[PDB]
Design a protein around this ligand. Structure first.
Ligand SMILES: *[C@@H]1O[C@H](CO)[C@@H](O[C@@H]2O[C@H](CO)[C@@H](O[C@@H]3O[C@H](CO[C@H]4O[C@H](CO)[C@@H](O)[C@H](O)[C@@H]4O)[C@@H](O)[C@H](O[C@H]4O[C@H](CO)[C@@H](O)[C@H](O)[C@@H]4O)[C@@H]3O)[C@H](O)[C@H]2NC(C)=O)[C@H](O)[C@H]1NC(C)=O
Ligand SMILES: *[C@@H]1O[C@H](CO)[C@@H](O[C@@H]2O[C@H](CO)[C@@H](O[C@@H]3O[C@H](CO[C@H]4O[C@H](CO)[C@@H](O)[C@H](O)[C@@H]4O)[C@@H](O)[C@H](O[C@H]4O[C@H](CO)[C@@H](O)[C@H](O)[C@@H]4O)[C@@H]3O)[C@H](O)[C@H]2NC(C)=O)[C@H](O)[C@H]1NC(C)=O
Ligand SMILES: *[C@@H]1O[C@H](CO)[C@@H](O[C@@H]2O[C@H](CO)[C@@H](O[C@@H]3O[C@H](CO)[C@@H](O)[C@H](O)[C@@H]3O)[C@H](O)[C@H]2NC(C)=O)[C@H](O)[C@H]1NC(C)=O
Ligand SMILES: *[C@@H]1O[C@H](CO)[C@@H](O[C@@H]2O[C@H](CO)[C@@H](O[C@@H]3O[C@H](CO)[C@@H](O)[C@H](O)[C@@H]3O)[C@H](O)[C@H]2NC(C)=O)[C@H](O)[C@H]1NC(C)=O
Ligand SMILES: *[C@@H]1O[C@H](CO)[C@@H](O)[C@H](O)[C@H]1NC(C)=O
Ligand SMILES: *[C@@H]1O[C@H](CO)[C@@H](O)[C@H](O)[C@H]1NC(C)=O
Ligand SMILES: *[C@@H]1O[C@H](CO)[C@@H](O)[C@H](O)[C@H]1NC(C)=O
Ligand SMILES: *[C@@H]1O[C@H](CO)[C@@H](O)[C@H](O)[C@H]1NC(C)=O
Ligand SMILES: *[C@@H]1O[C@H](CO)[C@@H](O)[C@H](O)[C@H]1NC(C)=O
Ligand SMILES: *[C@@H]1O[C@H](CO)[C@@H](O)[C@H](O)[C@H]1NC(C)=O
Ligand SMILES: *[C@@H]1O[C@H](CO)[C@@H](O)[C@H](O)[C@H]1NC(C)=O
Lengths: 214, 315, 160, 43, 315, 37
């Protein structure tokens, strides 16, 4: 039976700087039988890449977007939202949406891998952790971790503040098409409204024939 | 052409002196002409500590040594020091720094609003955009943005190579005082094609209620002890802290070095007055010459010509 | 006379049932094609919504039911054979639709087996939505196939 | 857990709605046939 | 029994430097008796650069300069360079080391000298080690090294939190008042298991020449028909900058609410000292009450009990 | 969840009302047909 595919980033930071090299690896149990190529989708475009690992030596602004990988005989993998910017300081995160009791890694990075020291991480404009050089990877994430994060650090000896990024830590309600789950209810209502109109017409005609067949 | 060497001791942590010993040796200096002077990173020290003695005497070259005591904190601040020898009219520099374990401290930009003295009395307000720690002046874009487009502009641009293995680039923007008085922002943009995004600053007249300063000049509190007399000017209850204070002697302007203006300090009362003091020391001869002095404070909150003069006499 | 006498109302009732089934099938086709036809989702999960089966089947059902309704009023005494042939080909259409429905059902079952956390992403959620749709369409197509086979056997009985 | 309940709820709602719609269509067909037969026979 | 002087050269910013230089000066040792060697990490030197050149002639005594050069890697390792002299069967050695870098892991250490008010009048001084920018209170060792006079006094250490995810550690060491006047050393040593080396910070009374402060109090010039009264007290020619100010007007002490003190600043040459202004603001209700106003000052240069009082009467 | 629950409640009430009206109308039409026979 066909299996699902998974896409991994190297480095696993979904936010990278311009010109950085990133490897997207698509190994979703492709070894069911023989080696095979890959299908890569970026903004609904089938790029001419059919390798397990796609390498971007010099990432650009246009490289940002929605990435999907699919192995032959396997279904498409989970989409990855790559976000490339050109700021002095960036707050790289492992993922943008984290389930309850999950873990996600956050790290403050400088331009061209410059030395970054005395970093403070603010959640909802409130500092929660002061890290010298280590990441602030959070384990067992709960609903209180949802919000806007940004890291303020020192490039060389100059104070900089990274752009604010919203990370949503919620339950399994990933959602998107719940409005279609209004579909059965809506369809029955339309259907029930059609039935009500039919009932009105039927009773009017029944009364009319009652004066007719009396 | 005398040669210069410059050394220092390190810490000797086992004993308390809290001092590093800078030693500048000058070899071959012409006799009775050595004028070695000590210089910080463009922060020349006024402390009277030379201790210059002769090591050996030859007749025409000889040698000499100059000694400084420096606090451990200043030596730790990665500051550069230099002994300068002015011999036969030519200068010679010998530099020293606790050289880094890191990279040259990135890039720092400063924006200086025009001084009130030139803003309200001798009209020529100029904004200063000064960038330091630059490796070199190569394709350095220094542009400006004003809320109101008045053309003219014609901002200057000049770079100065410091001894601290670095250069500083300064630009002066000539503005008219009316826009600043009414309130208009200005931005300086510095762009080196190695930057993720241009660095932009913002200067604007500080928001808040304007308070008219009150200026009081005190009589000399000392007695007939000769030496020096002290004149005090207290300026209180003004907003913002942008203020200019100078002393006038019988209509003639006294130089900056004589008078000292204290740094602004937040007032305890519910007025945000930023009370300030200015002191002037006067020699006995000047006081006995029957001279008249004037405090000439300049502030924005005052009506035209925004000058408050308080007169103090001798008789 | 069993069905020979029962048909006088059953023909109209099953024709109206065919019209209803065609209408909701067309509704599903239009809604899913407008909403659930993005390139991000895979193609195997939307087996029905890849060959044009919903629109074609809805058109065939609507046309056949309309012809049956018009013929039930004794119009020109000619539409009986046309309705018989239309529902005869609709029988094969419904069989093909059932085959496509079961293929999509087993594909969605495999996809849901691949899913572990029960709709942990867009793909599994839209797969559950698609299998829902498959179950409805299977019920509606069973109803339509029963209608078509009843109408066809009745019209064969008349045409002998 | 939570979505399957409303899932099955909507499925049974749709099934009951379809059954009721066929029942009402049968009622409409029967009443029209009766009305048209009575009008043709009486008039 | 000669005199040792170890001096390591600079790491010049203006040019490129990779030959960091070490000089060992021996003064007063016996003529024609040189056995100088170099010792790194208690292991004999291997480089052949071991020149021993006679600086000059001192009769039966002599002066010898030992010259060595090394690279950055030999210095960046924080080694134990010494120059050993085997004179008259006695091994004289002096230790030189690369100074431990301040804020090794970004922690900023402030160690405040005791306030003159609590050290000269109250009689209960304290040394405050105020390390900031830490991460957790895990294995943070703050120790007090009482040089010369070890004593038996203990220390009180505690933690303090803010909202920056930065833990602060404050340690108070109660010392004896006489010892500060005597000038014995004191040191705070901070140790962390992420630190490569524990850090040491020491200060005592600022060395220099003691100058008796001069205090003058000014009358309120603020136009008595107005509401508020301002009191000015100028204290000048005081060294060092450590000085205490208080107001004991009409008996008891006025709390630190209606009081402010100007930051110390250096005088314009002449005498090596500082000047400060203290301003006290009161209302009409407190004023015109036939009370006294005294601007008391405490400084080490003063005679016992180190108190100078300038008093004015509202009468 | 709660939205489809309240829609389910109102739709069950609507279906019960429609079923009762259909039963009444079917009883009436059956009685009329029996009287016609
Ligand atoms: C290499 O060596 C050069 C030698 O000049 C250094 O250049 C100096 O660097 C220092 C610090 O980097 C500069 O000091 C800063 O100056 C700013 C502007 O100065 C004007 O305005 C102030 C009033 O604000 C006047 O007093 C002054 O006379 C000038 O008119 C100040 O705004 C800065 O203060 C700000 O920061 C401090 C904290 O540092 C705050 O406490 C203040 O409140 C304020 O926010 C600061 O004082 C100095 O101007 C530079 N000189 C020149 C000529 O450019 C290089 O820095 C050095 N580089 C390295 C890596 O060592
Ligand atoms: C998160 O927030 C905390 C607390 O707000 C910050 O910690 C502060 O850090 C600053 C900078 O390191 C500290 O400022 C320094 O305080 C020293 C101690 O002050 C004591 O003594 C003075 C009298 O001198 C008292 O008025 C005061 O109440 C204290 O009792 C000062 O001595 C320092 O001044 C010296 O250094 C400066 C240069 O930095 C010189 O210009 C001065 O002339 C002087 O030589 C300095 O002001 C501050 O004290 C800390 N707070 C506390 C409560 O201790 C964290 O830094 C912040 N997080 C980050 C990442 O920044
Ligand atoms: C497919 O869609 C992605 C979005 O996920 C496109 O990337 C987005 O567009 C450009 C890259 O070409 C980035 O630059 C920005 O564009 C916006 C307009 O959308 C503009 O207002 C900004 O000033 C900036 O120029 C944009 O950041 C990027 N989106 C993200 C989130 O980074 C991608 O371009 C699309 N594919 C093609 C072929 O266009
Ligand atoms: C991808 O990265 C970009 C950064 O290039 C993100 O855009 C940033 O989104 C935040 C919102 O959280 C913006 O902050 C807001 O900006 C508005 C601007 O007026 C300001 O008014 C708000 O107070 C707030 O600060 C931020 O400006 C914006 N950055 C840029 C350059 O536009 C983006 O959210 C990331 N994700 C996606 C999916 O694109
Ligand atoms: C992609 O396909 C082409 C043509 O089939 C082939 O030449 C190429 O080697 C493939 N890429 C990889 C990485 O194997
Ligand atoms: C901050 O980050 C560190 C990682 O060094 C982690 O151990 C800690 O739990 C985080 N949170 C706080 C409140 O320190
Ligand atoms: C989440 O945060 C809110 C407000 O910040 C707080 O009231 C609530 O108690 C937090 N959650 C938990 C489980 O404590
Ligand atoms: C100043 O330097 C001289 C040089 O011999 C030294 O003797 C003296 O102890 C030093 N004083 C201080 C306070 O460092
Ligand atoms: C600097 O910026 C201005 C404005 O964009 C531009 O006209 C100029 O060519 C740039 N180059 C230099 C060297 O200043
Ligand atoms: C040792 O280093 C110094 C430092 O400049 C240099 O002048 C000298 O020539 C070096 N010695 C040798 C033998 O190269
Ligand atoms: C000092 O040593 C270690 C430093 O990590 C610390 O755990 C210990 O508790 C301290 N002991 C004393 C007596 O200060």
């Amino acid at each position: 039976a066909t299996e699902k595919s998974v896409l991994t980033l190297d480095p696993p930071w979904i936010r990278i700087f311009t010109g950085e090299k990133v490897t997207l690896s698509c190994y979703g149990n492709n070894h069911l039988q023989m080696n095979s190529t890959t299908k890569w989708i970026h903004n609904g475009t089938v790029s001419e890449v059919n390798s397990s690992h796609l390498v971007i030596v010099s990432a650009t602004v246009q490289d940002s977007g929605k990435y999907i990988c699919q192995k032959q005989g396997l279904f498409k993998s989970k989409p990855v939202y790559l976000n490339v910017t050109q700021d002095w300081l960036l707050l790289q995160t492992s993922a943008d949406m984290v389930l309850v009791h999950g873990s996600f890694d956050i790290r403050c990075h400088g331009w061209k891998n410059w030395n970054v020291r005395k970093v403070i991480y603010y959640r909802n404009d409130h500092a929660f952790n002061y890290s010298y050089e280590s990441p602030v990877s959070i384990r067992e994430a709960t609903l209180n971790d949802s919000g806007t994060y940004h890291c303020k650090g020192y490039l060389r000896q100059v104070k900089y503040e990274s752009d604010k990024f919203r990370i949503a830590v919620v339950k399994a309600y990933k959602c998107k098409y719940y409005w279609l789950q209004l579909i059965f209810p809506l369809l029955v209502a339309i259907l029930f409204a059609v039935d009500t109109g039919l009932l009105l017409s039927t009773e009017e005609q029944f009364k009319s024939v009652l004066e007719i067949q009396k | 052409d005398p040669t210069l060497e410059l050394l220092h001791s390190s810490c000797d942590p086992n004993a308390f002196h809290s001092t590093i010993q800078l030693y500048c040796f000058i070899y071959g200096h012409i006799l009775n002409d050595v004028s070695v002077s000590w210089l910080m990173d463009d922060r020349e020290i006024t402390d009277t500590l030379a201790q210059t003695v002769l090591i050996k005497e030859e007749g025409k070259l000889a040698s000499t040594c100059s000694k400084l005591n420096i606090t451990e904190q200043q030596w730790m601040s990665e500051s550069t020091f230099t002994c300068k020898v002015t011999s036969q009219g030519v200068d010679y520099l010998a530099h020293t720094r606790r050289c880094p374990d890191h990279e040259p401290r990135g890039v720092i930009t400063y924006l200086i609003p025009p001084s009130p003295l030139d803003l309200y009395q001798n009209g020529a307000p100029k904004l200063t955009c000064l960038v330091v720690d630059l490796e070199s002046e190569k394709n350095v874009n220094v542009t400006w943005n004003q809320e109101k487009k008045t053309s003219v502009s014609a901002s200057q641009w000049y770079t100065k190579h410091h001894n601290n293995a670095t250069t500083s680039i300064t630009s002066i923007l000539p503005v008219v005082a009316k826009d600043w008085i009414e309130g208009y922002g200005y931005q300086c943009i510095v762009d080196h094609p190695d930057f993720p995004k241009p660095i932009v600053r913002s200067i604007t007249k500080t928001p808040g209620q304007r308070s008219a300063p009150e200026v009081y000049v005190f009589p000399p509190p000392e007695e007939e002890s000769e030496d020096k007399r002290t004149l005090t000017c207290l300026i209180q209850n003004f907003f913002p802290e942008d203020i200019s204070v100078q002393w006038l002697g019988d209509g003639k302007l006294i130089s900056n070095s004589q008078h000292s203006t204290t740094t602004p300090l937040k007032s305890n009362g519910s007025n945000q007055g930023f009370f300030i003091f200015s002191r002037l020391e006067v020699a006995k001869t000047l006081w006995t010459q029957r001279k008249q002095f004037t405090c000439q404070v300049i502030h924005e909150a005052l009506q035209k010509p925004r000058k408050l003069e308080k007169t103090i006499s001798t008789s | 006379q069993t069905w020979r006498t029962f048909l006088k109302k059953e023909l109209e009732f099953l024709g109206a049932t065919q019209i209803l089934v065609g209408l909701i099938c067309l509704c599903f086709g239009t809604i899913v094609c407008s909403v659930l036809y993005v390139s991000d989702f895979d193609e195997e999960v939307l087996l029905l919504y890849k060959l044009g089966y919903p629109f074609w089947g809805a058109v065939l059902f609507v046309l056949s039911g309309f012809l049956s309704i018009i013929s039930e009023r004794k119009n020109t005494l000619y539409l009986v054979r046309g309705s018989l042939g239309a529902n005869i080909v609709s029988s094969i259409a419904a069989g093909t639709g059932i085959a496509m429905l079961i293929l999509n059902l087993t594909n969605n079952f495999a996809y849901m087996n691949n899913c572990k956390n029960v709709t942990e992403d867009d793909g599994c959620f839209v797969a559950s939505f698609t299998t829902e749709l498959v179950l409805m369409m299977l019920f509606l197509t069973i109803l339509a196939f029963c209608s078509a086979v009843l109408f066809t056997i009745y019209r064969i009985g008349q045409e002998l | 857990g939570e979505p399957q309940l409303c899932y099955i709820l909507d499925a049974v709602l749709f099934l009951y709605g379809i059954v009721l719609t066929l029942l009402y269509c049968r009622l409409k067909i029967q009443v029209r046939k009766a009305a048209i037969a009575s009008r043709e026979k009486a008039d």
